[PDB]
């Protein structure tokens, strides 16, 4: 006897009052936990790419190197985005959720997760958003899977946190199917601003237009977390369908609690709002990878677990 999700339209949204009603109306459809402002609004930019004239000289390292190279520029653009004709907020600094430090004892993840700034997660956090480090790195796959556990765990992994994407959409196995790694840049908002969010979405659409895209993006989704007591190559094209939105439903069930616990933020008695995804599409060229070819090319210090 209790719901866990609640969806409301984006058209006219405002957080429910904290205490304006002592007792909610008996036939009201809003769940009993939908009272205060959310802990944070989560915005995800789903980046999907493809290599059109795929040929035999490409290697599995390219499948990771080509998309993640654009990640640094995309993150910089998102961070420096400003609404040029704003009436309220201008940039991301006035709306993002600030984090000071990780919990003591998580020093192993220092310089891997953001600190003393906006909570902005991207695969560039592996190299600290430094394209120089990314280019000088001789083992991209090794760096990505450096902290990957060898056995299943309840908590979400650092790779999952920094990619914002289910496991099957990434990984080295994509090269066998000629597909390409797809990742997500996750933005965590303390406040909601429809004008700023629309400006960001339109700016990203102008920069990286997505062909044959018809995503709805009509409703927010509110997720409430309960307390726990135990005492002829034919490279596939970039298709956007009904399973690209609502992709957070396929993450691990401890993803968001794991992410928020690192910064001493609890979701035990509260809820979060998940904004509709912002599509971004990249078109890549094999000649780019062939020119960016490096020594130590096809020998990484990483193999899939259990073969």
């Amino acid at each position: 006897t209790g719901p866990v999700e609640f969806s409301t339209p984006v058209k006219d949204y405002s957080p429910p009052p904290v205490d304006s009603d002592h007792k909610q109306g008996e036939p009201s459809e809003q769940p009993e936990w939908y009272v205060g402002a959310p802990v944070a609004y989560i915005q995800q930019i789903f980046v999907k790419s493809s290599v059109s004239p795929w040929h035999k000289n490409l290697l599995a390292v390219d499948v990771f190197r080509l998309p993640l190279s654009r990640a640094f520029q995309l993150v910089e653009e998102i961070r420096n985005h400003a609404l040029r004709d704003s009436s309220g907020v201008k940039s991301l600094e006035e709306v993002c959720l600030q984090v000071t430090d990780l919990l003591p004892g998580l020093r192993k993840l220092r310089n891997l997760l953001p600190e003393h700034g906006c909570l902005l997660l991207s695969p560039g956090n592996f190299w600290q958003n430094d394209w120089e480090r990314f280019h000088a790195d001789p083992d991209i796959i090794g760096t990505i899977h450096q902290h990957e556990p060898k056995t299943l765990q309840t908590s979400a992994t650092l790779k999952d946190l920094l990619f914002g994407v289910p496991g099957k959409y990434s990984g080295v196995s994509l090269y066998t199917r000629k597909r390409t790694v797809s990742y997500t840049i996750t933005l965590v908002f303390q406040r909601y601003d429809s004008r700023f969010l629309s400006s960001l979405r339109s700016r990203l659409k102008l920069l990286h237009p997505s062909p044959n895209c018809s995503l709805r993006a009509e409703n927010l989704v509110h997720v409430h977390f309960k307390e726990e007591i135990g005492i002829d190559s034919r490279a596939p094209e970039v298709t956007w369908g009904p399973e690209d939105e609502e992709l957070w439903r396929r993450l691990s069930f401890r993803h968001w609690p794991t992410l928020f616990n690192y910064y001493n933020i609890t979701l035990a008695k509260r809820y979060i709002s998940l904004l509709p995804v912002i599509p971004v599409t990249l078109r890549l060229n094999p000649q780019e990878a062939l020119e960016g070819r490096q020594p130590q090319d096809g020998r990484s210090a990483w193999a899939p677990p259990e073969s």
Partner: antibody, heavy 120, light 108 residues
Framework: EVQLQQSGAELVRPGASVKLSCTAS????????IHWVKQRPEQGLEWIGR????????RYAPKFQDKATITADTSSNTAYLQLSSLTSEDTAVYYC?????????????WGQGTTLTVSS | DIQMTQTTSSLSASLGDRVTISCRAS??????LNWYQQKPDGTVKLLIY???RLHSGVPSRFSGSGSGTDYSLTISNLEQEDIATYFC?????????FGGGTKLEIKR
């Protein structure tokens, strides 16, 4: 579908004040900004300013700080432009327009325009 | 402020032929140039936004291209209803400015 119906022509003595009107049909002005554009026969198009009806926040070009005043009314679904201290230089055709994309900032729908004449 | 200049104020043309309209910005505007069509009746219509994006319902005859400070608007084949005045607007710096406008004419 979306339309912007403006008022009629005006003929006002210099030194007076005028209040143009812009009635929006097919959408609520609470959603998008409302802009006013000045056009003269031999001076091109000039941008005056805009209003956010959901907030009442307005801003103007530096040339129109002491000349124009824009106001909007959600209930009547109408936006107004007020010109003060009229002068012979102020005769022009004033257009009412909006945008819906907030990064490209393109005026997607335009009114028919109101001709304003200033003469003794 | 950014000044937009349409050098060819009047441009002679003919039906069927292709027409190009070019305006140059005082400084880089980062592909933020919209094109507007003003019919002789007085109505203003939007053709191209950003730098090459066609507005919904605009015929495919219209196209745009350019970079930096130089941009252009082209018509594949001029029709009778295409005779109007064309303005280019920059939306890079907040005080939006328009061009001088170019009026198309029929060859005689």
């Amino acid at each position: 579908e979306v339309q912007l119906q403006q008022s009629g022509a005006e003929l006002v003595r210099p030194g007076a004040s005028v209040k143009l009107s812009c009635t929006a049909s097919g959408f609520k002005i609470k959603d998008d900004y409302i802009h006013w554009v000045k056009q003269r026969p031999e001076q091109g198009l000039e941008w005056i300013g805009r209003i956010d009806p959901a907030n009442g926040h307005t801003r103007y070009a530096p040339k129109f700080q002491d000349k124009a005043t824009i106001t909007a009314d959600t209930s009547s679904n109408t936006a107004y432009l007020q010109l003060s201290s009229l002068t012979s230089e102020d005769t022009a055709v004033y257009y009412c327009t909006r945008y819906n994309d907030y990064d490209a900032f393109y005026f997607d729908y335009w009114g028919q325009g109101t001709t304003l004449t200033v003469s003794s | 402020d950014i000044q937009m200049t349409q050098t060819t104020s009047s441009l002679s043309a003919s039906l069927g032929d292709r027409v190009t309209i070019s305006c140059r910005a005082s400084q880089d505007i980062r592909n933020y140039l919209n094109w507007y069509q003003q019919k002789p009746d007085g109505t203003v219509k939007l053709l191209i936004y950003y730098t090459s994006r066609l507005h919904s319902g605009v015929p495919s005859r219209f196209s745009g291209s350019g970079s930096g400070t130089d941009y252009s608007l082209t018509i594949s084949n001029l029709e009778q209803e295409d005779i109007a005045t064309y303005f280019c607007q920059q939306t890079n710096t907040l005080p939006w400015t328009f061009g001088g406008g170019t009026k198309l004419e029929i060859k005689r």
